[PDB]
């Protein structure tokens, strides 16, 4: 099996080689990555980072960006996951198919985030903060990224303040998701390396 919901189905043909499975996987997740790229070009300060930092922020923040965007793919009430093809699989189904604790963590993250029911403006501004908050370890001009990060955060607070005048705490709740997304990312690369069993 391949239980990543970027798949179009967790079901893998047992009679296809590893690289042909992976290529099928790829023509499913490749569009979603390209939309993170497109989305980055539309963050205005982003185009003003060097080419190297732009690529590095995307290399490191794409997963986090997607976890935010596709959090809606985790139905906490139905206890189902929607895969990219559109089909839904129960949690119980996926656990017997190989899934474990990262799936449960993603449901808890998604439940709490879907709970906020952010609009698309709030979300798109949130995701951009998530992108330029990517781990900085390969970044050359850290100060300029932290200045873009700082600018995008200020817009987030202003937008939240106008949209939730009586609920200021949403803003801090959104920031405190950043370490949660970073743990989901680590565990999820650990899942990727375990691809070698």
């Amino acid at each position: 099996h391949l239980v990543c919901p970027m798949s179009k189905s967790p079901y893998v043909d047992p009679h296809k080689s590893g690289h042909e499975i992976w290529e099928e996987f790829s023509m499913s997740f490749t569009p979603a990555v390209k939309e993170v790229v497109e989305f980055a070009k539309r963050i205005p300060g982003f185009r003003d980072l060097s080419q190297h930092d732009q690529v590095n922020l995307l290399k490191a923040g794409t997963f986090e960006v997607l976890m935010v965007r596709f959090a809606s793919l985790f139905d906490a009430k139905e206890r189902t996951v929607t895969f990219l093809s559109g089909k839904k699989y129960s949690v119980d189904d996926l656990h017997s198919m190989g899934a474990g604790d990262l799936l449960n963590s993603m449901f808890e993250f998604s439940e709490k985030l879907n709970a906020l029911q952010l609009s698309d403006e709030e979300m798109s501004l949130f995701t951009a903060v998530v992108l330029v908050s990517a781990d900085r370890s390969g970044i050359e001009n850290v100060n300029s990224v932290e200045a873009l990060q700082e600018t995008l955060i200020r817009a987030l607070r202003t937008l939240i303040m106008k949209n939730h005048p009586n609920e200021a705490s949403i803003f801090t709740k959104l920031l405190l998701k950043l370490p949660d997304l970073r743990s989901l990312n680590n565990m999820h690369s650990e899942e990727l390396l375990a691809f070698k069993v």
Binding site: S26, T30, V33, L58, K59, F63, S189, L192
Partner: peptide, 15 residues
């Protein structure tokens, strides 16, 4: 070490 590295080729190609 290996992470979202299978994503590298898609990002560089839009650059």
């Amino acid at each position: 070490i290996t992470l979202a590295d299978h994503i590298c080729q898609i990002i560089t190609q839009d650059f």
